[PDB]
Design a protein around this motif. Structure first.
Motif: not given
Ligand code: NAG
Lengths: 220, 194, 213
Positions: A120-129, A142-143, A185-187, A215-219
Protein backbone atom coordinates in the motif's frame (compact mmCIF):
# COMPACT_ATOMS: atom_id res chain seq x y z
CA UNK A 1 15.70 12.37 -37.28
CA UNK A 2 14.94 9.07 -35.52
CA UNK A 3 13.27 8.48 -32.16
CA UNK A 4 11.82 5.87 -29.78
CA UNK A 5 9.50 6.87 -26.90
CA UNK A 6 8.16 4.32 -24.39
CA UNK A 7 5.08 4.88 -22.27
CA UNK A 8 2.58 2.95 -20.20
CA UNK A 9 4.74 2.21 -17.18
CA UNK A 10 3.37 2.43 -13.69
CA UNK A 11 2.35 0.66 -10.51
CA UNK A 12 0.54 -2.69 -10.83
CA UNK A 13 -0.20 -5.49 -8.37
CA UNK A 14 1.16 -9.04 -8.79
CA UNK A 15 -1.12 -10.96 -11.13
CA UNK A 16 -2.08 -7.75 -12.92
CA UNK A 17 -1.79 -6.75 -16.56
CA UNK A 18 -0.12 -3.84 -18.32
CA UNK A 19 0.57 -2.74 -21.91
CA UNK A 20 3.61 -0.67 -22.81
CA UNK A 21 3.94 1.35 -26.01
CA UNK A 22 6.95 2.35 -28.09
CA UNK A 23 6.21 5.07 -30.67
CA UNK A 24 8.88 5.25 -33.37
CA UNK A 25 9.91 8.04 -35.76
CA UNK A 26 12.19 7.40 -38.72
CA UNK A 27 12.37 3.63 -38.48
CA UNK A 28 9.49 1.70 -39.91
CA UNK A 29 8.74 -0.67 -37.03
CA UNK A 30 7.12 -3.23 -39.36
CA UNK A 31 10.32 -3.30 -41.45
CA UNK A 32 12.69 -3.83 -38.50
CA UNK A 33 13.58 -6.35 -35.88
CA UNK A 34 12.39 -4.64 -32.71
CA UNK A 35 13.31 -5.83 -29.20
CA UNK A 36 12.27 -5.05 -25.65
CA UNK A 37 15.09 -5.02 -23.05
CA UNK A 38 14.61 -4.55 -19.32
CA UNK A 39 16.70 -3.54 -16.32
CA UNK A 40 15.60 -4.37 -12.79
CA UNK A 41 16.60 -1.64 -10.28
CA UNK A 42 20.32 -1.84 -9.51
CA UNK A 43 20.77 -4.78 -11.89
CA UNK A 44 21.99 -5.42 -15.41
CA UNK A 45 20.14 -5.66 -18.68
CA UNK A 46 17.96 -8.50 -19.97
CA UNK A 47 16.63 -8.96 -23.47
CA UNK A 48 13.00 -10.05 -23.18
CA UNK A 49 11.33 -10.19 -26.62
CA UNK A 50 11.80 -9.54 -30.37
CA UNK A 51 9.44 -9.13 -33.35
CA UNK A 52 10.55 -9.84 -36.94
CA UNK A 53 9.44 -7.76 -39.91
CA UNK A 54 7.65 -10.82 -41.30
CA UNK A 55 5.76 -11.32 -38.01
CA UNK A 56 7.63 -14.08 -36.12
CA UNK A 57 7.96 -13.45 -32.37
CA UNK A 58 10.36 -14.80 -29.74
CA UNK A 59 10.66 -14.50 -25.97
CA UNK A 60 13.10 -15.01 -23.14
CA UNK A 61 12.25 -17.93 -20.91
CA UNK A 62 11.36 -15.75 -17.93
CA UNK A 63 8.46 -14.09 -19.79
CA UNK A 64 7.34 -16.85 -22.20
CA UNK A 65 3.57 -17.35 -22.05
CA UNK A 66 2.94 -14.14 -20.12
CA UNK A 67 4.23 -11.31 -22.36
CA UNK A 68 3.21 -10.59 -25.95
CA UNK A 69 5.04 -8.30 -28.33
CA UNK A 70 3.07 -6.78 -31.18
CA UNK A 71 2.99 -3.71 -33.39
CA UNK A 72 0.52 -1.41 -35.15
CA UNK A 73 2.00 -0.52 -38.55
CA UNK A 74 -0.41 2.40 -38.96
CA UNK A 75 0.76 4.13 -35.78
CA UNK A 76 4.42 3.08 -36.21
CA UNK A 77 4.22 1.86 -32.61
CA UNK A 78 5.58 -1.26 -30.87
CA UNK A 79 3.79 -2.91 -27.94
CA UNK A 80 4.51 -5.33 -25.12
CA UNK A 81 1.40 -6.75 -23.45
CA UNK A 82 2.44 -7.97 -19.97
CA UNK A 83 0.13 -10.44 -18.25
CA UNK A 84 0.34 -12.30 -14.94
CA UNK A 85 2.90 -9.81 -13.67
CA UNK A 86 5.35 -10.80 -10.92
CA UNK A 87 7.38 -8.78 -8.43
CA UNK A 88 10.53 -9.73 -10.35
CA UNK A 89 9.17 -8.08 -13.54
CA UNK A 90 9.84 -4.73 -11.83
CA UNK A 91 12.20 -3.00 -14.24
CA UNK A 92 12.76 -0.12 -16.57
CA UNK A 93 11.62 -1.39 -19.98
CA UNK A 94 13.41 -0.20 -23.12
CA UNK A 95 12.42 -0.64 -26.72
CA UNK A 96 15.30 -0.77 -29.20
CA UNK A 97 15.70 -1.19 -32.93
CA UNK A 98 17.58 -4.44 -33.48
CA UNK A 99 20.14 -4.91 -36.24
CA UNK A 100 20.92 -8.42 -34.97
CA UNK A 101 24.54 -9.39 -35.49
CA UNK A 102 24.86 -6.83 -38.31
CA UNK A 103 24.65 -3.83 -35.99
CA UNK A 104 23.16 -4.89 -32.62
CA UNK A 105 20.81 -2.56 -30.69
CA UNK A 106 21.73 0.82 -32.19
CA UNK A 107 18.86 3.07 -30.98
CA UNK A 108 17.10 2.77 -27.62
CA UNK A 109 14.25 4.71 -26.08
CA UNK A 110 14.50 6.40 -22.70
CA UNK A 111 12.63 3.52 -21.02
CA UNK A 112 9.46 3.26 -18.98
CA UNK A 113 9.39 2.01 -15.37
CA UNK A 114 7.07 -0.87 -14.35
CA UNK A 115 6.67 -1.46 -10.61
CA UNK A 116 4.95 -4.71 -9.62
CA UNK A 117 4.15 -4.66 -5.91
CA UNK A 118 1.47 -5.55 -3.37
CA UNK A 119 2.41 -2.76 -0.94
CA UNK A 120 0.00 0.00 0.00
CA UNK A 121 1.06 3.60 -0.60
CA UNK A 122 2.29 4.97 2.73
CA UNK A 123 4.08 8.06 4.01
CA UNK A 124 7.36 7.49 5.86
CA UNK A 125 8.10 7.68 9.54
CA UNK A 126 11.06 10.01 10.16
CA UNK A 127 13.35 9.17 13.03
CA UNK A 128 16.38 11.12 14.30
CA UNK A 129 19.92 9.88 13.87
CA UNK A 130 21.11 11.85 16.90
CA UNK A 131 24.70 13.20 17.01
CA UNK A 132 26.86 11.26 19.42
CA UNK A 133 27.37 12.94 22.80
CA UNK A 134 31.05 11.96 22.64
CA UNK A 135 31.75 15.24 20.80
CA UNK A 136 35.55 14.92 20.82
CA UNK A 137 34.97 13.00 17.52
CA UNK A 138 37.18 14.85 15.08
CA UNK A 139 35.79 18.32 15.88
CA UNK A 140 33.15 17.11 13.42
CA UNK A 141 29.85 15.47 14.39
CA UNK A 142 27.53 13.31 12.29
CA UNK A 143 23.74 13.36 12.51
CA UNK A 144 20.79 12.63 10.26
CA UNK A 145 17.30 11.28 9.66
CA UNK A 146 16.04 7.75 9.13
CA UNK A 147 13.19 7.85 6.59
CA UNK A 148 11.48 4.53 7.11
CA UNK A 149 8.64 2.44 5.69
CA UNK A 150 7.30 4.38 2.73
CA UNK A 151 5.91 3.36 -0.65
CA UNK A 152 6.32 4.00 -3.47
CA UNK A 153 9.49 5.90 -4.44
CA UNK A 154 10.53 8.67 -4.21
CA UNK A 155 11.12 10.70 -1.09
CA UNK A 156 13.16 13.87 -1.20
CA UNK A 157 15.15 15.15 1.79
CA UNK A 158 16.49 18.63 2.49
CA UNK A 159 18.11 20.11 5.59
CA UNK A 160 17.14 23.42 7.25
CA UNK A 161 14.77 24.13 4.34
CA UNK A 162 17.69 24.05 1.91
CA UNK A 163 20.10 26.26 3.88
CA UNK A 164 22.24 23.21 4.76
CA UNK A 165 23.65 21.41 1.70
CA UNK A 166 27.35 21.00 2.44
CA UNK A 167 28.35 17.62 3.84
CA UNK A 168 24.90 16.07 3.21
CA UNK A 169 24.64 12.47 2.00
CA UNK A 170 21.16 11.20 1.15
CA UNK A 171 21.48 7.51 0.51
CA UNK A 172 19.64 5.44 -2.11
CA UNK A 173 16.59 3.69 -0.70
CA UNK A 174 16.65 0.00 0.13
CA UNK A 175 13.52 -2.08 -0.45
CA UNK A 176 12.76 -4.02 2.70
CA UNK A 177 11.31 -7.52 2.86
CA UNK A 178 7.99 -5.91 3.84
CA UNK A 179 7.89 -4.25 0.41
CA UNK A 180 8.36 -0.78 1.93
CA UNK A 181 11.36 1.46 1.30
CA UNK A 182 13.75 2.93 3.84
CA UNK A 183 16.41 5.59 3.44
CA UNK A 184 18.85 7.59 5.54
CA UNK A 185 20.03 11.17 5.06
CA UNK A 186 23.09 12.26 7.07
CA UNK A 187 25.15 15.41 7.49
CA UNK A 188 28.50 16.06 9.17
CA UNK A 189 28.61 19.37 11.05
CA UNK A 190 30.97 21.08 13.55
CA UNK A 191 30.62 19.44 16.98
CA UNK A 192 30.68 22.97 18.41
CA UNK A 193 27.36 23.82 16.75
CA UNK A 194 25.48 20.98 18.47
CA UNK A 195 24.39 23.21 21.34
CA UNK A 196 23.42 26.18 19.21
CA UNK A 197 22.41 25.45 15.60
CA UNK A 198 19.09 23.77 14.93
CA UNK A 199 19.22 20.85 12.47
CA UNK A 200 15.90 19.94 10.83
CA UNK A 201 15.52 17.43 8.02
CA UNK A 202 12.60 18.19 5.67
CA UNK A 203 11.08 15.03 4.17
CA UNK A 204 8.62 15.04 1.26
CA UNK A 205 6.72 11.99 -0.02
CA UNK A 206 4.47 13.24 -2.80
CA UNK A 207 2.56 9.98 -3.45
CA UNK A 208 1.21 10.19 0.11
CA UNK A 209 1.02 14.03 0.34
CA UNK A 210 3.39 13.68 3.29
CA UNK A 211 5.61 16.52 4.52
CA UNK A 212 7.59 15.95 7.73
CA UNK A 213 10.14 18.25 9.39
CA UNK A 214 12.18 16.43 12.06
CA UNK A 215 14.37 18.36 14.48
CA UNK A 216 17.48 16.30 15.25
CA UNK A 217 19.30 17.16 18.46
CA UNK A 218 21.64 15.66 21.03
CA UNK A 219 19.87 13.11 23.26
CA UNK A 220 19.00 13.76 26.96
CA UNK B 1 20.13 -46.85 -62.73
CA UNK B 2 21.07 -45.89 -59.18
CA UNK B 3 19.72 -42.58 -57.96
CA UNK B 4 22.66 -40.11 -57.91
CA UNK B 5 22.54 -39.40 -54.19
CA UNK B 6 26.35 -39.26 -54.13
CA UNK B 7 26.31 -36.13 -56.27
CA UNK B 8 24.12 -34.56 -53.58
CA UNK B 9 25.43 -35.73 -50.20
CA UNK B 10 29.08 -35.89 -51.28
CA UNK B 11 29.23 -32.68 -53.33
CA UNK B 12 32.30 -30.54 -52.78
CA UNK B 13 30.65 -27.09 -52.62
CA UNK B 14 27.32 -26.57 -50.89
CA UNK B 15 25.04 -23.61 -51.55
CA UNK B 16 24.32 -20.72 -49.24
CA UNK B 17 20.88 -21.33 -47.69
CA UNK B 18 19.39 -18.23 -49.35
CA UNK B 19 20.35 -19.68 -52.75
CA UNK B 20 19.64 -23.30 -51.82
CA UNK B 21 20.26 -25.91 -54.51
CA UNK B 22 17.56 -28.24 -55.80
CA UNK B 23 18.38 -31.49 -57.60
CA UNK B 24 15.56 -33.31 -59.40
CA UNK B 25 15.90 -37.07 -58.86
CA UNK B 26 14.01 -39.21 -61.36
CA UNK B 27 13.99 -42.51 -63.28
CA UNK B 28 16.31 -44.35 -60.93
CA UNK B 29 16.55 -46.84 -58.06
CA UNK B 30 16.93 -45.18 -54.65
CA UNK B 31 18.65 -47.13 -51.89
CA UNK B 32 17.70 -45.06 -48.87
CA UNK B 33 18.95 -47.77 -46.49
CA UNK B 34 22.66 -47.04 -47.11
CA UNK B 35 21.80 -43.57 -45.71
CA UNK B 36 19.50 -44.01 -42.67
CA UNK B 37 21.79 -46.78 -41.40
CA UNK B 38 24.94 -44.69 -41.39
CA UNK B 39 26.79 -43.02 -38.54
CA UNK B 40 27.33 -39.88 -40.61
CA UNK B 41 24.15 -37.98 -39.72
CA UNK B 42 23.27 -35.97 -36.61
CA UNK B 43 19.77 -35.31 -37.98
CA UNK B 44 17.57 -37.72 -39.90
CA UNK B 45 13.89 -36.82 -39.51
CA UNK B 46 11.16 -37.95 -41.89
CA UNK B 47 7.61 -36.62 -42.14
CA UNK B 48 4.63 -38.33 -43.74
CA UNK B 49 6.78 -41.44 -44.25
CA UNK B 50 8.55 -43.84 -41.92
CA UNK B 51 12.34 -43.72 -42.39
CA UNK B 52 12.69 -47.51 -42.08
CA UNK B 53 10.23 -48.34 -44.86
CA UNK B 54 11.67 -45.92 -47.44
CA UNK B 55 13.01 -48.68 -49.68
CA UNK B 56 9.52 -50.21 -50.11
CA UNK B 57 8.15 -46.96 -51.55
CA UNK B 58 7.79 -45.55 -55.05
CA UNK B 59 7.42 -41.85 -55.85
CA UNK B 60 6.60 -39.71 -58.86
CA UNK B 61 9.63 -37.48 -58.32
CA UNK B 62 12.07 -36.79 -55.53
CA UNK B 63 13.78 -33.44 -54.98
CA UNK B 64 16.97 -33.14 -52.97
CA UNK B 65 17.54 -29.63 -51.60
CA UNK B 66 20.86 -28.75 -49.96
CA UNK B 67 22.59 -25.82 -48.25
CA UNK B 68 24.65 -24.96 -45.16
CA UNK B 69 23.26 -23.38 -41.96
CA UNK B 70 24.20 -23.23 -38.29
CA UNK B 71 23.77 -26.28 -36.09
CA UNK B 72 21.32 -24.49 -33.85
CA UNK B 73 19.27 -23.63 -37.00
CA UNK B 74 18.69 -27.20 -38.19
CA UNK B 75 15.63 -27.24 -35.90
CA UNK B 76 14.05 -24.63 -38.23
CA UNK B 77 14.25 -26.96 -41.23
CA UNK B 78 10.97 -28.69 -40.35
CA UNK B 79 7.26 -28.00 -40.86
CA UNK B 80 5.69 -25.42 -38.58
CA UNK B 81 8.95 -23.68 -37.59
CA UNK B 82 9.76 -19.97 -37.43
CA UNK B 83 13.06 -18.10 -37.32
CA UNK B 84 15.46 -16.27 -39.64
CA UNK B 85 16.12 -19.42 -41.69
CA UNK B 86 12.53 -20.67 -42.00
CA UNK B 87 11.00 -17.23 -42.56
CA UNK B 88 13.51 -15.66 -45.00
CA UNK B 89 15.70 -18.42 -46.45
CA UNK B 90 14.21 -21.93 -46.73
CA UNK B 91 10.61 -22.78 -45.76
CA UNK B 92 9.05 -26.25 -45.48
CA UNK B 93 5.25 -26.54 -45.93
CA UNK B 94 2.94 -27.72 -43.17
CA UNK B 95 2.07 -30.85 -45.20
CA UNK B 96 5.69 -31.74 -45.92
CA UNK B 97 6.31 -35.35 -46.97
CA UNK B 98 10.01 -36.19 -46.91
CA UNK B 99 13.20 -36.33 -44.89
CA UNK B 100 15.55 -33.74 -43.39
CA UNK B 101 19.19 -34.89 -43.18
CA UNK B 102 22.07 -32.90 -41.65
CA UNK B 103 25.65 -33.44 -40.50
CA UNK B 104 28.30 -31.28 -38.87
CA UNK B 105 30.72 -29.92 -41.51
CA UNK B 106 33.03 -27.84 -39.29
CA UNK B 107 36.02 -29.59 -40.89
CA UNK B 108 35.29 -28.52 -44.47
CA UNK B 109 33.29 -25.33 -43.96
CA UNK B 110 35.32 -23.50 -41.29
CA UNK B 111 38.55 -21.55 -41.66
CA UNK B 112 40.99 -20.38 -39.01
CA UNK B 113 40.26 -16.69 -39.47
CA UNK B 114 36.58 -17.29 -40.03
CA UNK B 115 34.90 -18.51 -43.19
CA UNK B 116 32.55 -15.78 -44.42
CA UNK B 117 31.59 -17.16 -47.86
CA UNK B 118 28.30 -18.73 -46.68
CA UNK B 119 25.39 -16.25 -46.43
CA UNK B 120 21.76 -16.10 -45.29
CA UNK B 121 19.01 -13.54 -45.88
CA UNK B 122 18.80 -11.26 -42.83
CA UNK B 123 16.29 -8.69 -44.16
CA UNK B 124 12.99 -9.39 -45.94
CA UNK B 125 9.61 -7.73 -45.61
CA UNK B 126 7.54 -10.91 -45.47
CA UNK B 127 8.01 -14.62 -44.98
CA UNK B 128 8.94 -17.01 -47.75
CA UNK B 129 6.34 -19.33 -49.18
CA UNK B 130 7.19 -23.06 -48.97
CA UNK B 131 9.97 -24.02 -51.42
CA UNK B 132 10.42 -20.36 -52.38
CA UNK B 133 13.96 -19.28 -53.27
CA UNK B 134 14.74 -15.56 -53.10
CA UNK B 135 18.07 -14.45 -54.57
CA UNK B 136 17.34 -10.70 -54.61
CA UNK B 137 20.19 -8.39 -53.57
CA UNK B 138 17.99 -5.27 -53.50
CA UNK B 139 19.05 -2.83 -50.77
CA UNK B 140 16.58 -3.15 -47.90
CA UNK B 141 14.68 -0.06 -46.78
CA UNK B 142 14.41 -0.01 -42.98
CA UNK B 143 13.53 3.67 -42.65
CA UNK B 144 11.11 6.22 -44.05
CA UNK B 145 13.14 7.13 -47.12
CA UNK B 146 13.82 5.00 -50.21
CA UNK B 147 17.36 3.71 -50.65
CA UNK B 148 17.31 3.40 -54.47
CA UNK B 149 20.03 0.77 -54.36
CA UNK B 150 22.49 2.77 -52.22
CA UNK B 151 23.70 1.31 -48.93
CA UNK B 152 23.72 3.40 -45.77
CA UNK B 153 21.87 4.11 -42.57
CA UNK B 154 18.48 2.32 -42.69
CA UNK B 155 19.54 1.03 -46.14
CA UNK B 156 21.01 -2.45 -45.84
CA UNK B 157 22.35 -5.19 -48.05
CA UNK B 158 19.86 -8.02 -47.33
CA UNK B 159 22.32 -10.92 -46.99
CA UNK B 160 24.52 -11.58 -43.94
CA UNK B 161 27.69 -13.64 -43.64
CA UNK B 162 27.73 -16.59 -41.23
CA UNK B 163 31.37 -16.34 -40.19
CA UNK B 164 32.27 -19.94 -39.34
CA UNK B 165 35.35 -20.51 -37.17
CA UNK B 166 36.60 -23.95 -36.01
CA UNK B 167 36.51 -22.89 -32.33
CA UNK B 168 32.84 -21.90 -32.54
CA UNK B 169 30.53 -23.53 -30.05
CA UNK B 170 28.64 -26.39 -31.65
CA UNK B 171 25.49 -24.37 -32.28
CA UNK B 172 27.53 -21.82 -34.23
CA UNK B 173 29.28 -24.46 -36.38
CA UNK B 174 28.26 -25.14 -40.01
CA UNK B 175 26.01 -28.10 -40.88
CA UNK B 176 25.35 -29.40 -44.39
CA UNK B 177 21.67 -30.18 -44.92
CA UNK B 178 19.90 -32.36 -47.48
CA UNK B 179 16.11 -32.17 -47.75
CA UNK B 180 14.48 -35.02 -49.66
CA UNK B 181 10.90 -34.20 -50.54
CA UNK B 182 8.78 -37.00 -51.95
CA UNK B 183 6.46 -35.93 -54.74
CA UNK B 184 3.33 -37.88 -55.58
CA UNK B 185 1.01 -37.31 -58.54
CA UNK B 186 -1.41 -39.37 -60.59
CA UNK B 187 1.56 -40.05 -62.82
CA UNK B 188 4.13 -42.80 -63.43
CA UNK B 189 6.34 -43.50 -60.41
CA UNK B 190 9.91 -43.05 -61.62
CA UNK B 191 11.81 -43.33 -58.29
CA UNK B 192 11.33 -46.63 -56.48
CA UNK B 193 14.37 -48.25 -54.98
CA UNK B 194 15.44 -51.85 -54.28
CA UNK C 1 22.90 -21.10 -23.01
CA UNK C 2 26.20 -19.23 -23.26
CA UNK C 3 27.65 -17.45 -20.22
CA UNK C 4 29.10 -13.95 -20.65
CA UNK C 5 31.61 -13.04 -17.93
CA UNK C 6 32.86 -9.48 -17.51
CA UNK C 7 35.84 -8.92 -15.23
CA UNK C 8 36.71 -7.07 -13.25
CA UNK C 9 33.41 -5.72 -11.98
CA UNK C 10 35.05 -2.34 -11.29
CA UNK C 11 37.99 -0.49 -12.87
CA UNK C 12 39.70 2.59 -11.39
CA UNK C 13 41.25 5.14 -13.73
CA UNK C 14 42.27 8.75 -14.22
CA UNK C 15 41.58 11.07 -17.13
CA UNK C 16 44.13 10.33 -19.84
CA UNK C 17 44.64 6.67 -18.94
CA UNK C 18 44.40 3.75 -21.32
CA UNK C 19 41.56 1.55 -20.04
CA UNK C 20 40.83 -1.99 -21.23
CA UNK C 21 37.74 -4.01 -20.21
CA UNK C 22 37.33 -7.69 -20.96
CA UNK C 23 34.45 -9.97 -21.75
CA UNK C 24 34.64 -13.75 -21.98
CA UNK C 25 32.00 -16.00 -23.57
CA UNK C 26 31.72 -19.63 -22.48
CA UNK C 27 31.82 -20.89 -26.11
CA UNK C 28 33.27 -19.51 -29.34
CA UNK C 29 30.94 -16.87 -30.84
CA UNK C 30 33.28 -15.69 -33.61
CA UNK C 31 33.00 -11.89 -33.78
CA UNK C 32 29.33 -11.53 -32.76
CA UNK C 33 29.75 -9.25 -29.77
CA UNK C 34 28.45 -5.77 -28.89
CA UNK C 35 29.66 -3.25 -26.31
CA UNK C 36 27.37 -0.75 -24.63
CA UNK C 37 27.89 2.18 -22.32
CA UNK C 38 25.33 3.25 -19.73
CA UNK C 39 25.17 6.15 -17.30
CA UNK C 40 22.89 6.42 -14.23
CA UNK C 41 19.25 6.97 -15.11
CA UNK C 42 19.93 6.84 -18.86
CA UNK C 43 19.42 4.27 -21.58
CA UNK C 44 22.39 2.18 -22.75
CA UNK C 45 24.18 3.42 -25.86
CA UNK C 46 25.84 1.17 -28.45
CA UNK C 47 29.62 1.62 -28.83
CA UNK C 48 30.97 -1.36 -30.79
CA UNK C 49 29.18 -3.98 -32.86
CA UNK C 50 30.59 -7.14 -34.45
CA UNK C 51 33.38 -7.13 -31.82
CA UNK C 52 35.43 -4.36 -33.44
CA UNK C 53 33.27 -2.01 -35.55
CA UNK C 54 32.94 1.49 -34.15
CA UNK C 55 29.38 2.78 -34.06
CA UNK C 56 28.64 5.98 -35.97
CA UNK C 57 29.12 8.99 -33.71
CA UNK C 58 31.24 7.16 -31.12
CA UNK C 59 34.62 8.80 -30.39
CA UNK C 60 37.60 6.99 -31.89
CA UNK C 61 39.34 6.51 -28.54
CA UNK C 62 36.87 3.60 -28.21
CA UNK C 63 37.88 0.37 -29.90
CA UNK C 64 36.92 -3.27 -29.61
CA UNK C 65 38.92 -6.37 -30.44
CA UNK C 66 38.92 -10.12 -30.02
CA UNK C 67 37.37 -13.12 -31.72
CA UNK C 68 36.03 -16.40 -30.42
CA UNK C 69 35.81 -16.39 -26.63
CA UNK C 70 37.89 -13.45 -25.36
CA UNK C 71 36.97 -9.86 -26.20
CA UNK C 72 38.26 -6.45 -25.14
CA UNK C 73 37.01 -2.90 -25.04
CA UNK C 74 39.78 -0.29 -24.99
CA UNK C 75 39.56 3.45 -24.36
CA UNK C 76 42.84 4.88 -25.56
CA UNK C 77 43.01 7.98 -23.33
CA UNK C 78 40.17 8.40 -20.84
CA UNK C 79 37.93 11.49 -20.84
CA UNK C 80 35.68 12.77 -18.01
CA UNK C 81 32.46 11.76 -19.75
CA UNK C 82 33.76 8.17 -20.11
CA UNK C 83 33.18 7.25 -16.46
CA UNK C 84 30.20 4.97 -16.73
CA UNK C 85 29.27 1.28 -16.72
CA UNK C 86 30.14 -0.90 -19.72
CA UNK C 87 28.33 -4.06 -20.85
CA UNK C 88 29.16 -6.66 -23.46
CA UNK C 89 26.44 -8.65 -25.21
CA UNK C 90 26.13 -11.92 -27.11
CA UNK C 91 24.66 -10.64 -30.39
CA UNK C 92 24.03 -13.80 -32.38
CA UNK C 93 22.09 -16.35 -30.32
CA UNK C 94 19.08 -16.28 -28.03
CA UNK C 95 18.70 -15.05 -25.42
CA UNK C 96 21.21 -12.28 -26.30
CA UNK C 97 22.82 -12.41 -22.87
CA UNK C 98 24.46 -9.25 -21.54
CA UNK C 99 27.57 -9.42 -19.41
CA UNK C 100 27.11 -8.32 -15.81
CA UNK C 101 28.80 -4.95 -16.44
CA UNK C 102 32.05 -3.18 -15.58
CA UNK C 103 31.92 0.12 -13.73
CA UNK C 104 34.55 2.73 -14.65
CA UNK C 105 35.18 5.02 -11.69
CA UNK C 106 37.57 7.82 -10.77
CA UNK C 107 40.85 7.00 -9.04
CA UNK C 108 41.90 9.25 -6.15
CA UNK C 109 44.03 9.04 -3.00
CA UNK C 110 43.09 6.38 -0.46
CA UNK C 111 40.82 7.81 2.24
CA UNK C 112 39.70 5.96 5.34
CA UNK C 113 36.04 6.23 6.39
CA UNK C 114 34.99 8.18 9.42
CA UNK C 115 32.66 5.74 11.18
CA UNK C 116 29.51 6.57 13.18
CA UNK C 117 26.96 4.32 14.91
CA UNK C 118 23.43 5.53 15.74
CA UNK C 119 21.11 3.74 18.21
CA UNK C 120 17.39 3.43 17.48
CA UNK C 121 15.41 6.45 18.57
CA UNK C 122 13.07 6.04 21.53
CA UNK C 123 10.29 7.22 19.21
CA UNK C 124 10.83 4.21 16.90
CA UNK C 125 11.24 1.77 19.79
CA UNK C 126 7.76 2.56 21.08
CA UNK C 127 6.43 1.41 17.70
CA UNK C 128 8.09 -1.99 18.27
CA UNK C 129 11.09 -2.00 15.89
CA UNK C 130 14.74 -0.96 16.34
CA UNK C 131 16.93 0.30 13.48
CA UNK C 132 20.65 0.59 14.26
CA UNK C 133 22.55 2.60 11.66
CA UNK C 134 26.27 2.46 10.92
CA UNK C 135 27.64 5.28 8.77
CA UNK C 136 30.93 5.14 6.80
CA UNK C 137 31.64 8.63 5.51
CA UNK C 138 33.85 9.92 2.68
CA UNK C 139 36.05 6.91 2.00
CA UNK C 140 38.02 5.64 -1.01
CA UNK C 141 38.34 3.00 -2.50
CA UNK C 142 34.78 1.68 -2.67
CA UNK C 143 35.58 -1.73 -1.16
CA UNK C 144 34.66 -1.84 2.52
CA UNK C 145 33.32 -4.42 4.95
CA UNK C 146 30.82 -3.72 7.74
CA UNK C 147 30.46 -6.41 10.42
CA UNK C 148 27.62 -5.98 12.90
CA UNK C 149 28.19 -7.51 16.34
CA UNK C 150 25.57 -7.88 19.07
CA UNK C 151 27.13 -8.82 22.41
CA UNK C 152 30.01 -10.07 20.19
CA UNK C 153 27.82 -12.45 18.17
CA UNK C 154 28.42 -11.72 14.49
CA UNK C 155 25.07 -10.72 12.94
CA UNK C 156 24.29 -12.11 9.49
CA UNK C 157 21.12 -11.69 7.45
CA UNK C 158 19.41 -8.82 9.32
CA UNK C 159 21.24 -5.86 7.76
CA UNK C 160 20.93 -3.93 4.49
CA UNK C 161 23.41 -1.39 3.18
CA UNK C 162 23.37 1.43 0.65
CA UNK C 163 26.23 3.38 -1.01
CA UNK C 164 26.31 6.84 -2.55
CA UNK C 165 27.59 7.61 -6.02
CA UNK C 166 31.18 8.81 -6.15
CA UNK C 167 31.19 12.39 -4.92
CA UNK C 168 31.38 14.90 -7.76
CA UNK C 169 33.82 17.11 -5.80
CA UNK C 170 36.17 14.79 -3.91
CA UNK C 171 35.42 11.42 -5.53
CA UNK C 172 34.75 9.62 -2.21
CA UNK C 173 32.00 7.17 -1.33
CA UNK C 174 29.77 7.13 1.72
CA UNK C 175 27.94 4.05 2.94
CA UNK C 176 25.03 3.40 5.28
CA UNK C 177 24.31 0.04 6.95
CA UNK C 178 21.12 -0.60 8.92
CA UNK C 179 20.66 -3.44 11.39
CA UNK C 180 16.96 -4.13 11.96
CA UNK C 181 15.64 -5.97 15.03
CA UNK C 182 12.33 -6.26 16.80
CA UNK C 183 11.95 -4.28 20.01
CA UNK C 184 11.94 -7.51 22.01
CA UNK C 185 15.13 -8.84 20.41
CA UNK C 186 16.86 -5.45 20.73
CA UNK C 187 16.16 -5.44 24.47
CA UNK C 188 17.76 -8.88 24.87
CA UNK C 189 21.28 -7.55 24.33
CA UNK C 190 23.62 -4.86 25.55
CA UNK C 191 26.59 -4.13 23.26
CA UNK C 192 25.87 -3.08 19.67
CA UNK C 193 28.89 -2.57 17.45
CA UNK C 194 29.72 -2.12 13.79
CA UNK C 195 33.25 -3.07 12.81
CA UNK C 196 34.61 -1.59 9.61
CA UNK C 197 37.43 -2.97 7.46
CA UNK C 198 38.92 -0.70 4.78
CA UNK C 199 42.20 -0.31 2.90
CA UNK C 200 42.80 3.05 4.58
CA UNK C 201 42.64 1.71 8.16
CA UNK C 202 45.64 -0.13 9.59
CA UNK C 203 43.24 -2.41 11.50
CA UNK C 204 39.44 -2.62 11.84
CA UNK C 205 37.71 0.30 13.54
CA UNK C 206 34.79 -0.52 15.85
CA UNK C 207 32.08 1.91 16.95
CA UNK C 208 29.77 0.66 19.65
CA UNK C 209 27.16 1.62 22.19
CA UNK C 210 25.55 -0.03 25.19
CA UNK C 211 21.76 -0.18 24.96
CA UNK C 212 20.35 2.58 27.17
CA UNK C 213 23.24 4.90 28.09
C1 NAG D 1 29.83 -40.58 -49.82
O1 NAG D 1 31.18 -41.09 -49.67
C2 NAG D 1 31.36 -41.97 -48.54
C3 NAG D 1 32.82 -42.36 -48.52
O2 NAG D 1 33.65 -41.21 -48.60
C4 NAG D 1 30.43 -43.17 -48.66
O3 NAG D 1 30.54 -43.95 -47.47
C5 NAG D 1 28.98 -42.72 -48.84
O4 NAG D 1 28.14 -43.85 -49.06
C6 NAG D 1 28.86 -41.75 -50.01
N1 NAG D 1 27.49 -41.29 -50.14
C7 NAG D 1 26.73 -41.52 -51.22
C8 NAG D 1 27.39 -42.29 -52.34
O5 NAG D 1 25.58 -41.13 -51.29
Amino acid sequence: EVQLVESGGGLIQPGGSLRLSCAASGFIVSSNYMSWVRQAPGKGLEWVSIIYSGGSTFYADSVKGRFTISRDNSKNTLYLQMNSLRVEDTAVYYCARDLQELGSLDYWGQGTLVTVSSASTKGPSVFPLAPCSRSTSESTAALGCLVKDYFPEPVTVSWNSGALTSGVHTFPAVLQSSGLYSLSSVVTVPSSSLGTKTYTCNVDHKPSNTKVDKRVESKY
Amino acid sequence: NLCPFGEVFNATRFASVYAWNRKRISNCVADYSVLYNSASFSTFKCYGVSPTKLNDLCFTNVYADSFVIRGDEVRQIAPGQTGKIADYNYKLPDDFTGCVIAWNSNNLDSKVGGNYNYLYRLFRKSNLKPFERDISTEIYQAGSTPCNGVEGFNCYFPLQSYGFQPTNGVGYQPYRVVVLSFELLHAPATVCGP
Amino acid sequence: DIQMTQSPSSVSASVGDRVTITCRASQGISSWLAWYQQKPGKAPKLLIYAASSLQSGVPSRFSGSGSGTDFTLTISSLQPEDFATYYCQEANSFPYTFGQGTKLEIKRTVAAPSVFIFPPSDEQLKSGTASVVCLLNNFYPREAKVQWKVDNALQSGNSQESVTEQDSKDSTYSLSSTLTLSKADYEKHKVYACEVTHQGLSSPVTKSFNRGE
